[PDB]
Design a protein around this ligand. Structure first.
Ligand SMILES: [Zn+2]
Ligand SMILES: [Zn+2]
Length: 140
């Protein structure tokens, strides 16, 4: 599932919990897939890393919701000691306030991404949705 500028995002609101799994070809986030030797390359990777380390900002989860990070995983060689995987588990005090999900912010911060294919699974059932910077909201 590897198309440059296209990323998959699986969501799952289960009571308090919210699980976001983002699989993306590395081209969208760092701007290449050759492991980083240069300094321009190493700063582009650390820029991405510290943006992905702040998932309440990227996914623009409302403050009103009481959202805190329980666990976060960035599977890629580029962030150890080519695709990128980014798994967040969140715990929202007031999950009822999570009415809507804005990738608008994600697009601003990784403008290399033109389309995000979204599999949401609520307690309502299962809903697909393609998101572009134009049309980047999803009724949760
Ligand atoms: Zn590629
Ligand atoms: Zn994972």
């Amino acid at each position: 599932k590897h198309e440059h500028g296209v990323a998959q995002l699986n969501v799952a609101l289960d009571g308090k919990t919210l699980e976001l799994e983002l699989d993306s070809p590395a081209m969208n986030l760092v701007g290449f897939e050759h492991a980083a030797s240069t300094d321009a390359d190493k700063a582009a990777v650390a820029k991405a890393r510290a943006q992905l380390e702040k998932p309440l900002e990227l996914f623009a989860l409302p403050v009103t919701a009481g959202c805190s990070v329980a666990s976060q995983e960035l599977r890629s060689p580029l962030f150890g000691d080519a695709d990128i995987h980014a798994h967040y588990q969140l715990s929202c005090e007031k999950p009822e306030l999570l009415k809507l999900l804005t990738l608008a912010e994600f697009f601003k911060r990784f403008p290399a991404t033109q389309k995000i294919q979204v599999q949401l699974i609520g307690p309502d059932g299962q809903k697909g949705a393609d998101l572009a910077p134009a049309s980047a909201e999803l009724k949760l």
